[PDB]
Amino acid sequence: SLSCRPPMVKLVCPADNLRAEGLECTKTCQNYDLECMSMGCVSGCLCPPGMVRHENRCVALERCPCFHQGKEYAPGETVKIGCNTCVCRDRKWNCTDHVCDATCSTIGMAHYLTFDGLKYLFPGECQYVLVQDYCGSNPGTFRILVGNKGCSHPSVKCKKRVTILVEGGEIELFDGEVNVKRPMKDETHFEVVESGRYIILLLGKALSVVWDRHLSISVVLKQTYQEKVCGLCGNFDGIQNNDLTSSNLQVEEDPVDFGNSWKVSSQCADTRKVPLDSSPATCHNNIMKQTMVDSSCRILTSDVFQDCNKLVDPEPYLDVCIYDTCSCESIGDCAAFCDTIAAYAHVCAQHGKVVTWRTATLCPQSCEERNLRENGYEAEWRYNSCAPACQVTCQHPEPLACPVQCVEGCHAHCPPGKILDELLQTCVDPEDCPVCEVAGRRFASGKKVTLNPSDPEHCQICHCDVVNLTCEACQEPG
Numbered sequence: 205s206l207s208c209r210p211p212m213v214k215l216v217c218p219a220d221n222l223r224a225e226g227l228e229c230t231k232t233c234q235n236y237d238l239e240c241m242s243m244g245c246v247s248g249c250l251c252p253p254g255m256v257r258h259e260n261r262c263v264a265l266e267r268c269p270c271f272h273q274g275k276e277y278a279p280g281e282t283v284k285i286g287c288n289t290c291v292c293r294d295r296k297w298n299c300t301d302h303v304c305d306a307t308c309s310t311i312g313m314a315h316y317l318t319f320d321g322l323k324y325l326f327p328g329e330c331q332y333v334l335v336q337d338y339c340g341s342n343p344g345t346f347r348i349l350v351g352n353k354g355c356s357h358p359s360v361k362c363k364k365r366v367t368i369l370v371e372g373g374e375i376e377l378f379d380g381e382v383n384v385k386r387p388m389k390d391e392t393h394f395e396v397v398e399s400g401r402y403i404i405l406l407l408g409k410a411l412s413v414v415w416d417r418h419l420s421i422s423v424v425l426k427q428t429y430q431e432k433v434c435g436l437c438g439n440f441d442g443i444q445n446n447d448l449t450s451s452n453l454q455v456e457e458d459p460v461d462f463g464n465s466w467k468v469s470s471q472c473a474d475t476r477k478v479p480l481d482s483s484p485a486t487c488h489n490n491i492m493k494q495t496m497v498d499s500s501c502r503i504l505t506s507d508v509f510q511d512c513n514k515l516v517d518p519e520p521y522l523d524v525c526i527y528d529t530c531s532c533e534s535i536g537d538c539a540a541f542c543d544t545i546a547a548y549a550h551v552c553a554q555h556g557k558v559v560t561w562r563t564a565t566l567c568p569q570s571c572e573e574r575n576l577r578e579n580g581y582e583a584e585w586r587y588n589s590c591a592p593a594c595q596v597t598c599q600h601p602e603p604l605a606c607p608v609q610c611v612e613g614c615h616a617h618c619p620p621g622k623i624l625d626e627l628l629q630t631c632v633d634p635e636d637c638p639v640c641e642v643a644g645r646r647f648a649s650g651k652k653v654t655l656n657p658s659d660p661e662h663c664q665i666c667h668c669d670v671v672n673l674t675c676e677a678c679q680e681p682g
């Protein structure tokens with residue numbers, strides 16, 4: 205019987221003893237909080253009770269590493285998921301609980317998906333506060349309103365109007381175009397980016413809107429606005445179960461009650477409650493169509509979406525897909541079907557799981573129509589499931605802090621060393637853009653850049669005629 209290296213102690217297995225546990229019940233950094241059942245003990249040397257065997261030596265239990273998705277991380281080695289960091293300390297994952305940047309989203313005709321993940325139905329026909337920071341003791345910087353007309357009982361034909369009020373300006377989203385009714389007092393960080401199917405609005409450093417030009421309206425807030433906003437999109441605090449809090453700080457169990465409390469004009473009437481129809485318009489008493497709609501919308505958890513289903517819950521997009529498609533006479537050309545599915549694929553792509561799902565049979569989209577090679581336009585337009593959203597063009601010469609990584613649609617491809625000119629729909633040399641530069645910032649002709657906004661002695665508003673740059677001092681408002 206040769207001695208064992210400390211602190212391991214030997215275990216002679218007695219055959220004449222009823223039960224015994226040897227090396228078969230060895231405890232490592234993996235199987236510690238588990239139980240063992242030995243057919244017969246294996247004689248050998250094992251670590252003392254307080255320790256576990258790890259890498260052929262006895263280690264303290266607290267010195268055990270943590271495991272994340274199979275990979276081993278030493279104690280102290282942090283992993284970052286989202287905007288939170290998880291430190292490995294004492295064989296445990298200690299994670300921060302910070303609220304990350306969030307997105308409010310209108311899904312489909314009459315559903316809303318709040319910043320904190322609450323999905324509810326609210327078929328209001330008036331104008332409502334989508335998101336605003338005028339809540340109680342308010343700084344009061346921005347207010348975004350949404351008006352729904354035709355998204356009620358007949359949802360086949362519906363149109364929405366979004367009104368954006370920020371920094372003294374009013375930007376309205378309606379009928380697939382952006383209308384800047386009143387400019388922001390400082391346009392330096394204001395951009396209207398048309399990319400693919402979408403229009404991306406930069407409304408300052410921390411407020412953005414992503415819009416598919418029809419009914420998918422998203423507000424992207426940075427986490428500095430947490431607990432500071434209210435309206436149909438909730439209070440943005442990481443707690444989903446309190447987003448149905450009305451304007452009078454009371455939790456409402458019915459979404460129709462919560463939504464009516466955010467009605468803007470007292471002229472129109474509040475929405476009255478209706479019992480939830482599990483089979484709306486064309487699915488009512490039609491088990492055949494309910495099966496067709498369920499099978500079509502079930503693409504959201506099919507193969508191409510399986511990777512994304514782990515990162516982004518498809519349940520709310522699937523509920524909305526089924527509810528809205530039940531208003532279409534045909535699922536092939538159904539607009540509510542493709543838009544809702546595309547809205548999910550868009551969120552997937554923001555999490556690094558770009559999903560190519562369209563086909564010529566199902567929701568086809570091609571760029572062949574606007575590929576005018578033989579017409580004097582030098583630009584090739586190719587569809588991409590997710591291409592960089594904020595590309596440098598003559599109209600956006602400085603690189604932008606884009607609220608989304610990429611978007612779906614048609615994107616122009618230019619020869620090496622050439623930049624897209626959006627107004628001319630053709631590729632041009634970067635020197636040929638009507639673009640000025642000041643303070644290291646390039647801005648397009650007609651854009652106004654404000655230098656030192658808060659400094660009355662150095663505030664300047666710079667204008668770009670074509671390539672001509674002129675700056676003027678600001679006027680003290682008195």
Ligand SMILES: *[C@@H]1O[C@H](CO)[C@@H](O)[C@H](O)[C@H]1NC(C)=O
Nearest residue numbers: 291293294296297298299300
């Ligand atoms: C994580 O660290 C904090 C201190 O930052 C401590 O209060 C908390 O108990 C730790 N949690 C775990 C599970 O180690």
Ligand SMILES: *[C@@H]1O[C@H](CO)[C@@H](O)[C@H](O)[C@H]1NC(C)=O
Nearest residue numbers: 560586587588589590591592
């Ligand atoms: C889309 O663009 C990416 C780069 O942004 C490229 O790698 C990919 O091959 C493109 N796919 C299609 C179908 O154009």
Ligand SMILES: *[C@@H]1O[C@H](CO)[C@@H](O)[C@H](O)[C@H]1NC(C)=O
Nearest residue numbers: 668669670671672673674675
């Ligand atoms: C630029 O503007 C100045 C006056 O501000 C004018 O004298 C000059 O001719 C302009 N140059 C061009 C190229 O337009």
Ligand SMILES: [Ca+2]
Nearest residue numbers: 320441443447
């Ligand atoms: Ca909340």
Ligand SMILES: [Ca+2]
Nearest residue numbers: 602644645646
């Ligand atoms: Ca620069």
